[PDB]
Amino acid sequence: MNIFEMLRIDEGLRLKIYKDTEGYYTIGIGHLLTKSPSLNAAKSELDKAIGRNCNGVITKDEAEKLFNQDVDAAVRGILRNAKLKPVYDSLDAVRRCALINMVFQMGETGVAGFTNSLRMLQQKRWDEAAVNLAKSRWYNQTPNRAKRVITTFRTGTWDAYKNL
Numbered sequence: 001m002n003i004f005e006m007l008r009i010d011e012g013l014r015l016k017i018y019k020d021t022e023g024y025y026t027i028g029i030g031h032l033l034t035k036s037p038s039l040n041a042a043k044s045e046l047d048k049a050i051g052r053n054c055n056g057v058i059t060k061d062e063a064e065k066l067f068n069q070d071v072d073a074a075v076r077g078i079l080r081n082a083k084l085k086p087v088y089d090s091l092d093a094v095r096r097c098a099l100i101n102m103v104f105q106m107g108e109t110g111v112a113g114f115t116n117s118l119r120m121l122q123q124k125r126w127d128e129a130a131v132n133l134a135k136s137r138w139y140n141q142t143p144n145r146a147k148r149v150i151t152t153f154r155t156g157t158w159d160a161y162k163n164l
Contacts, residue, residue, distance in 0.1 A: 001158040003071060003097045007104055009164050010145050013063060017042055017056040021142055028063035030104065031070060074103045083112040090122050098152040105145075106138065121153065130154040 011030035017039065020026045025033040025042035033045040039056075046054045050062055058066075078084045078099065088099055099121075102111050111118075114136070120129035130150045133139065139146040151160035 001097075001161055003100055004067070006097055006101060006158075006161060007067070007071065009161055010101065010105070010148070013060070015058055015060065015063065017046065027058055027066070029067040029070075031063075031066040070104065071100070074100050077108040078103055081108050081112055083118070084108065087118045087122050090124075092156055094156045094158065095121070095153055098149050101149050101152075102138075126154050126156075 008029060013029055014027060017025055017027050017033065020032065024035050025039065025045075027033060027046060031049075033042045033049070036042070043054070043056055046056060046058070049066065050058060078088050084099070084103070088096055091099065099111070102114075114133065117129050117132045120132055130153060133150050133153065134146070136146075139150075148160040148164075152158070
């Protein structure tokens with residue numbers, strides 16, 4: 001497993017515009033288009049993103065391309081965020097993927113927000129952070145995925161993804 005394989009599992013692949021867990025227009029491997037309720041806004045965003053007339057459909061190549069940009073963006077966002085950098089730099093290679101996973105899913109600001117959980121990760125207090133992390137909207141809304149990610153932070157292994 002690597003970060004690509006992990007996000008691939010959490011997000012699945014769709015070549016047609018679809019609605020998020022939160023009902024937002026997305027495509028590919030979890031590539032949010034817009035939070036606006038109009039399919040029209042979404043298609044406009046899709047065309048902009050791809051640089052062609054898509055009419056709500058992309059190719060797999062194009063999906064993977066958005067995915068390459070989004071993983072790259074998540075890493076760089078981390079490394080630039082004053083709050084996320086130190087945590088990332090303190091973690092081992094498996095757990096770094098867990099952090100990325102959250103930033104990909106809820107954004108930089110989303111994650112910078114888990115003050116207590118990040119303090120716990122930095123301190124390598126793994127059980128404690130897993131409990132703290134479960135005390136969130138994230139976990140109540142997407143439990144299956146959150147368990148997989150929390151499990152990764154707790155164990156530093158890929159066992160949560162092996163099953164899948």
